[PDB]
Ligand binder design. Structure first.
Ligand SMILES: [Mg+2]
Length: 116
RNA sequence: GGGAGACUUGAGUGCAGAAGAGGAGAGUGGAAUUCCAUGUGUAGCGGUGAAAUGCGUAGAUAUAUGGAGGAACACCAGUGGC
């Protein structure tokens, strides 16, 4: 119901950006994404859509009561920063920013190149 | 060229060292993917030039904690090595 510390997971891919705000224990509290704000197609991948997604999820998160979050950024999407700053704007206190992009230490064979 | 000798440079042995993803066998490590279980959580997720098929309110994706299994070995790493 009422939290004081949390973490905001910015899952930003090439196609879409999902913003998920959890408590420090990883339990979800609020989440938004470019797709759930009406953005479709390439628009979902833009920094502005990432910005709007962060705002909509931030405001819901602060309705619960939540002051300061740390940010984990993942994926190659262009909207990582626009989300990080949007968190600060809408009211949250961004204390730390980390990169948690998974990296195989090799790992599995990736899919084929998109031509031929 | 054949025969009987002699020789130490070619070739090999000894002795002393040097480096190495050379090979074979048996173990073993972490990262990641997938699946599985359990919380949290809510309507999307995924994808393209643009879309749709697909997946999701029988609760997804995300996120947290674990479990299983397979394959490949980030950095080191280099017209570097064998
Ligand atoms: Mg194919």
């Amino acid at each position: 119901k009422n939290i004081e510390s949390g973490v905001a997971h910015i899952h930003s891919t090439f196609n879409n950006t999902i913003v998920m705000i959890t408590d420090t224990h990883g339990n979800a509290l609020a989440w938004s994404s470019a797709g759930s704000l009406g953005f479709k197609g390439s628009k979902k991948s833009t920094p502005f859509a990432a910005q709007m997604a962060a705002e909509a999820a931030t405001k819901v998160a602060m309705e619960h009561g939540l002051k300061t979050v740390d940010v984990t950024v993942k994926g190659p999407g262009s909207g990582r920063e626009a989300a990080i700053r949007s968190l600060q704007a809408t009211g949250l206190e961004v204390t730390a920013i980390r990169d948690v992009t998974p990296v195989p230490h090799x790992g599995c064979r990736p899919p084929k190149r998109r031509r031929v």
